[PDB]
Amino acid sequence: GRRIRVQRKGAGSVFRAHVARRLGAAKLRANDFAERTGSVRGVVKAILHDRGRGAPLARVQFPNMRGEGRVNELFIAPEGMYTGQEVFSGNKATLHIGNILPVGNIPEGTYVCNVEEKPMDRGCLARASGTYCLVVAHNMETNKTRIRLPSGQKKLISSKARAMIGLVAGGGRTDKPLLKAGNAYHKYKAKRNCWPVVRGVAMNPVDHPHGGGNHQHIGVSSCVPRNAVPGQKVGLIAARRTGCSGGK
Amino acid sequence: AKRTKKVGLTGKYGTRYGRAARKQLLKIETSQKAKYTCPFCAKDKVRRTACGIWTCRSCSKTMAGGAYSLHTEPANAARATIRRLRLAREDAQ
Amino acid sequence: MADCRVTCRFHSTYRTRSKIVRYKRTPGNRLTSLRVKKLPNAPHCAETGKQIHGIPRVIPQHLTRQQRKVSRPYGGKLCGSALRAHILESFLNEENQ
Amino acid sequence: QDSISLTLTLVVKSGKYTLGTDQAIRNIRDGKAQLVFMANNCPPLVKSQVDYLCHLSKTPVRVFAGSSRELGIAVGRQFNVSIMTILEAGDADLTSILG
Amino acid sequence: PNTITEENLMKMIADGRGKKLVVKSCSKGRLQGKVKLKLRTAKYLYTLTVPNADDAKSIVKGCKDKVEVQYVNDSE
Amino acid sequence: SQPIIKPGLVCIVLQGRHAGKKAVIVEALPHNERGSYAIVAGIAALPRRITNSMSDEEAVCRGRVRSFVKCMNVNHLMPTSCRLENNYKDFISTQTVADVTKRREIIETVNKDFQRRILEHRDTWFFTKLPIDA
RNA sequence: GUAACCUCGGGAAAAGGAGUGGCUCUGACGGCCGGGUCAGAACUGGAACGGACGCGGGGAUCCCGACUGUUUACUAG
RNA sequence: GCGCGGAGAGGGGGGCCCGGGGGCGGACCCCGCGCGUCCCCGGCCGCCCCUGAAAAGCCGGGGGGCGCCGGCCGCGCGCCG
RNA sequence: GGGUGAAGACCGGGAAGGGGCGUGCCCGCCCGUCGAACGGGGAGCCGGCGGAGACUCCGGCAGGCGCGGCCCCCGCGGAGA
Ligand SMILES: [K+]
Ligand SMILES: [K+]
Ligand SMILES: [Mg+2]
Ligand SMILES: [Mg+2]
Ligand SMILES: [Mg+2]
Ligand SMILES: [Mg+2]
Ligand SMILES: [Mg+2]
Ligand SMILES: [Mg+2]
Ligand SMILES: [Mg+2]
Ligand SMILES: [Mg+2]
Ligand SMILES: [Mg+2]
Ligand SMILES: [Mg+2]
Ligand SMILES: [Mg+2]
Ligand SMILES: [Mg+2]
């Protein structure tokens, strides 16, 4: 046979993300001495649309603390943030929607977004439109805090990791049908080359393990083991069960 | 309702996609084409610009909101919870 | 004359936004082509995106120094309305602060 | 609990008042207002300016418990009102529910 | 090309800024028997139309030998 | 319940060429059909800067002061809590600001008066620049 | 003048009828002269007028695929 | 078609921009009228799980430091198609 | 700077990585005079002439950008826009 679609994707070429006309990487403000002691004030300048992304981005201007002038940031906007609003970051930031503060100072039961797994990594956990995390409990003896992820799993992170109050803006996007093939075309034209999708049973044996036969059908079981080598891992990988169980 | 009985704005689709999709689109599109009261000046001049971006045609203030509607119920619940938790802390410092 | 069709005046014939012409009659009873130059935008406010009064829509290099200025402390960077807010805001803040 | 609504109705019926921010500033500067009422969504910089001027003229300033739309309804009007100043209460108006 | 006024014509001729002066007699149409004075300068060509032929003689005689002079007087 | 626009008050210019500068009200005109106006005198340029080098010829120029006198709309002013006692009202009046030569004479007089007060270290707040962060 | 059926949006130009030239007139619609269009009448031609040109044949049903789209360049749309 | 107004409408009086037009020059200009076509521009409105390049270069403002900076008259503008 | 591979070669931010004014001081983390005869870009029109060239020649009338001489000035008006 020849190389499969999954094997060809990993080599780049016509399978790279289309990044032209993107505003940049969205991140929390970097951690420094000024906000390790007090608070730093900024102002929201604009709210913009990012190609490929479902959630809006906000441009926030802060004073420069190692010289003269100003510093421009790029945040993921929580719901309810408006142009001209002033926000704070630091150990002494107040509990308002746009503010950034460490999770140790956030009361249990609060909604947070753009949480950082390890201190000083600039956010990585709740970044897609409509998502949020919950602060569950604190442990002052070990200095660790428990959170609940959008998938429902529970994780322990250090109490010095920062987050933003609120939930990500743009919630409800997936409640509307795409309806037409032309809509999915535009959606994926803003992201990467991955659409439309040809079924494996509709191919010839030379280019997929599912192809061939006098009727269209999968010859064997579709569950493959975890240790299958790269050209073999197609179908359901290491599935614990299959079918529509119906219960919890 | 002089021209149609039930399709409403989904009359632009003819007969092409089925009943369930058309009903859901009726609800969502009615919501997303509407005019909303501005939280800063109490006027009904807020319109959608992009998926989660809403602008006021009077004061020119831009806000981050939901897709298809300015406010979402989870957001209201979250804001109320934050406001409650903020007062309890400030009483005892 | 019974024919009024012309020929292209540029190096190539591809019609981009910088290759627009209009037609005029010459003293020799001939139809000629003249370029239509792009009109630049005048300066716009920093705080708002509105246009600033008093400056024409020409590239600044072809204006005299007086023609590209406004007689006000922040003239040409912000409008009169935006300047009042900064003055009021700074005074009222520094009085309480 | 109590209604400051009776006072507004009587002032609107027999008194003298002005609706708007420009008229309010022109009156307060001149020492002609007896009370300034303000909504809770008035823009902050106008709030500061009007407060400071009232301080410089020893004028009483109060805040209303609604939005400019609510105040406009409470004065019998169909538009928003951010600042109201009463120049002369009426013989039926007891400007003693606020001050 | 630009129009010039009478007073700053012989002034320019005074500062020796004109390079040549041409006199042309117009006698058809809205140019009814009037004359046009065209002065060649370093930057521009300046033209004045005296309302009557007589005024031409005085001014030109007021700058004779100060700037070289031509005549046209087309009669066709 | 007391009017606040009275001679001797210190305001701030909000509009025009001299916006953002401080001034003193010398005469409040009576309300007419054009609105409310007043006559003010304000600092047009502050005394520059002088340092340890002390080069006298340039020092005198650097220490010079300018001022403006004119009537202006009372809507274009921000009254303050400060005061500045003076007596300019004798040579300052409506008819003495309409003509030009009188205006120039008044301007030099006010310039000389301001220079003194600056030297003797009085009225520090009035003779200071209002920071603006546009 | 238009049926069954229908996801109530369609089906639908459904099906199916009648008129249309030339000449001489009448009315309607603007502005402080202009313009075309729409409507009506008499007369008159081998019972003829979308006079060349340009320009749907229709209906009743069954099977397959929902639909617009793509495909074996040179025998399969 | 819309849209706007106490965060200031209508009215009266003004300022700014407008790839344009008229007059006089260039140059001793037959006179009026009108429907349509093409191109460009303008203010609105509509659409998107699609938001519709960048840099050289040029200019302005704040603060600081410095000082003729314009007018007239002369010259010049290389390489390659 | 380097890293890797028997090499050819391929991969690459962690490296004491430049200027100015003018001689002493001051400023400064780190590539490209590569890649568009359709994108950006300081400025051109008319008349005439040959056998074969013209927005290029000649006549006229203009624009832009520099350099050199002579005179040659460090802001006033408005109520406000
Ligand atoms: K599939
Ligand atoms: K090129
Ligand atoms: Mg096959
Ligand atoms: Mg195989
Ligand atoms: Mg088969
Ligand atoms: Mg101007
Ligand atoms: Mg099909
Ligand atoms: Mg088809
Ligand atoms: Mg074939
Ligand atoms: Mg075939
Ligand atoms: Mg290149
Ligand atoms: Mg080009
Ligand atoms: Mg030439
Ligand atoms: Mg040829």
For residue F57, give both structure tokens.
Answer: 């010829």
C1' nearest to CA of B50: which nucleotide?
Answer: H51
The enclosing H or E element of B80 equals helix B73-92
- How far is C58 from chain F, CA to nearest CA, in Å? 25
Structure tokens at F69: 């006198």
- Straight-line distance from the first to the last Cα atom of chain C, in angstroms, rounded to the nearest whole number: 81
Give the CA-to-C1' distance from C35 to H39 in angstroms: 13
DSSP at A93: -
Q: φ and ψ at D96, to 5 degrees?
A: -135, 15
Strand I nucleotides where any atom sits below 7 Å of a protein CB: 37-43, 45-48, 55, 61-65, 75-81
- Least Cα distance to F41 among F95, F98, F134, F111 occurs for F111
Structure tokens at F41: 């005198």
Q: In angstroms, rounded to a whole number, what is the distance separating the alpha carbons of residues A102 and A97?
A: 14
Q: What does the alpha-carbon distance between residue D43 and residue D47 come to, in Å, rounded to a whole number?
A: 6
- Between CA E16 and CA E38 the distance in angstroms is 15
Cα C66 to Cα C54, C55, C69, C71, C73: the distances in Å are: 11, 10, 6, 10, 15
Method for structure elucidation: cryo-EM
Q: Is the CB of C61 under 7 A from strand H?
A: yes
CA–CA distances in Å: residue E1 to residues D93, E38, E67:
79, 10, 19
Q: Distance from first CA to last CA of chain A, Å, rounded? A: 43
Other Cβ atoms closer than 10 A to B37: 15
Nucleotides of G under 7 A from a protein CB: 7-10, 66-68
Alpha helical stretches, state H, D4-75: 5-14, 21-29, 44-57, 68-74
Tell whether C34 lies on the interface with D, counting CB pairs under 8 A: no
Touching B (3+ Cβ pairs <8 A), the chains are A, D
Answer yes or no: are the C-beta atoms of A169 and A55 closer than 8 Å.
yes
CA distance D29 to D85: 12
Indicate which ligand has the atom closest to the C-alpha of A2: 4
Closest nucleotide to C27: CA versus each C1': I46
Residue to mutate among D22, D56, D58, with most F CBs inside 10 A, is: D56
| Close Cβ partners of B75 (under 8 Å, ≥ 6 residues apart) | A79, A80, A166, A167, A171, B66
Residue type, D68: S
Minimal Cα distance from F36: which residue of D?
A: D26
Q: How far apart are CA A67 and CA B75, in angstroms?
A: 39
Rounded CA-CA distance E30/E33 in Å is: 9
* Å separating the CA of residue C69 from the C1' of nucleotide H26: 33
* Contact yes or no for A42/A28 (Cβ under 8 A): no
Which residues are B48's β-sheet partners?
Answer: B54
Strand pairing partners for E27? none
How far is ligand 3, taken at its centre, from the CA of residue A214, in Å?
A: 10
DSSP label of B24: H
Binding-site residue numbers of C for Mg(2+) are 54
In order, the DSSP letters of C28-92 are TS-EEEEE-PPPPPPPB-SSS-PBPTT--SS-GGGS-TGGG--SSTTTTTS-HHHHHHHHHHHHH
Residues with CB under 7 A from strand G: A 180-182; B 4-7, 11, 14-19, 22
Q: What letter does residue B1 receive in the DSSP assignment?
A: -
One-letter amino acid of C26: T
Peptide bond into B39 cis (omega under 30): no
Picking from B24, B39, B51, the nearest residue to A177 by CB comes out as B24
DSSP code for B78: H
Q: What resolution in angstrom units was achieved for this structure?
A: 2.5
Residue B39: both structure tokens together: 């939280």
Question: Is omega for the bond preceding A196 within 30 degrees of 0, making it cis?
Answer: yes
What is the C-alpha to C-alpha distance for residues F44 and F59, in angstroms, rounded to an integer? 19
**Could you tell me if A138 and A147 are in contact, meaning their C-beta atoms sit under 8 angstroms apart?**
no
Rounded to the nearest angstrom, the distance between the alpha carbon of C9 and the centre of ligand 2 is 18
Provide the edge-to-edge strand list for the sheet that holds B53-56.
B36-37, B44-50, B53-56, B62-64
Rounded to whole angstroms, the Cα distance separating A162 from A149 reads: 15
CB contact under 8 A, A179 and B17: yes
**Residues F9, F27 contacting (CB under 8 angstroms):** no
* C70-to-C52, C61, C82, F66 alpha-carbon distances in Å: 9, 17, 15, 21
CA distance E59 to E69: 12
